[PDB]
Design a protein around this ligand. Structure first.
Ligand code: MAN
Ligand code: MAN
Ligand code: CA
Ligand code: CA
Ligand code: CA
Ligand code: CA
Ligand code: CL
Lengths: 111, 112
């Protein structure tokens, strides 16, 4: 896997379209090593290819596969407010669930 | 090492540049036959390369203004047809053709 970070911020729909444009997908860490690699390429908070849009509190990658490895920041995922169904990687490498309509950097994954 | 990725949609060079730059990459510029073939492997149809002769006609440079050495022009190219062809695309046989920078093609991005 190769990871590339965007320079501009955007909602998940646009982030997905960006990674897809170059035939990749939004980065999904499967272990601590991939998590670190993604953190290092990201200079700020960035979207990961994980959501619980289909079923609340059931986090899966953009292809419907349930994720095994997680690295939630203490207190997350909390689905605050009207709902948080997307996931971002904070600058310390931990994850936070956020609204899919908010804007963050994106890290794309390629094989 | 360099990694090459191809776009799905067609777009003019300026847009191709913005796409590759969005992920901190550049438009692919083969420096030898091996890279040219690697770009061929990922490009399913005619695609833009990061080469132009916009500064001086018939003096091809990469997008950073650096004069290229290796070229793989298709027989009869570059011919700068009509109002001018100052951008470059990799044909489906790996050879190159100069085309208008305003025409749309797939883009192959390069990362290191
Ligand atoms: O305090 C943590 C809390 O901060 C904000 O409200 C958002 O980033 C939430 O997603 C997060 O859970
Ligand atoms: O005959 C080859 C010629 O075909 C078209 O006119 C264009 O693709 C030109 O760039 C190319 O040189
Ligand atoms: Ca949720
Ligand atoms: Ca949250
Ligand atoms: Ca020309
Ligand atoms: Ca030509
Ligand atoms: Cl949401």
């Amino acid at each position: 896997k190769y990871f590339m970070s965007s320079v501009r911020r955007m909602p998940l729909n646009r982030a997905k379209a960006l990674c897809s444009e170059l035939q990749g997908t939004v980065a999904t860490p499967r272990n601590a090593e991939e998590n670190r690699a993604i953190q290092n390429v990201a200079k700020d908070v960035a979207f990961l290819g994980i959501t619980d849009q289909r079923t609340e509190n059931v986090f899966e990658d953009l292809t419907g596969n349930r994720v095994r490895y997680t690295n939630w920041n203490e207190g997350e995922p909390n689905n605050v407010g009207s709902g948080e169904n997307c996931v971002v990687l904070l600058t310390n490498g931990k994850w936070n669930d956020v609204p899919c309509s908010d804007s963050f950097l994106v890290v794309c994954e390629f094989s």
